[PDB]
Design a protein around this ligand. Sequence first.
Ligand SMILES: Cc1ccccc1NC(N)=S
Length: 123
Amino acid sequence: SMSYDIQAWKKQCEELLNLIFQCEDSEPFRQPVDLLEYPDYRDIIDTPMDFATVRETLEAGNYESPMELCKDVRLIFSNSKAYTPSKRSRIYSMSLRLSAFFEEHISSVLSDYKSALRFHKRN
Ligand SMILES: Cc1ccccc1NC(N)=S
């Protein structure tokens, strides 16, 4: 059970997603972009991603690890940098703040999970 629990990352990521939805900085990134308002979004972005999608994928049981979750969240940020490239944009700034918040918090979730992995593989 609790030390080196390889399932513990799920509730941790659920809690982090909760913090992210609270942050005013996540507002542009909560829901999928709308095609008909930004008709060019798909001209620029190959693989859309948003935090409601990540939260539903996690709820569905479709991430095998926290690294898979982290990949999808990092796609949100990389997509924002491609679509809104200008450092003058407030949206750019928001993206950067929220990325840094995510990367701070996910850090321990990842390290703990990989520790757990390393322990159970060794024993
Ligand atoms: C932040 C934003 C607002 C409106 C339209 C597009 C975007 N960019 C992404 N969601 S990647």
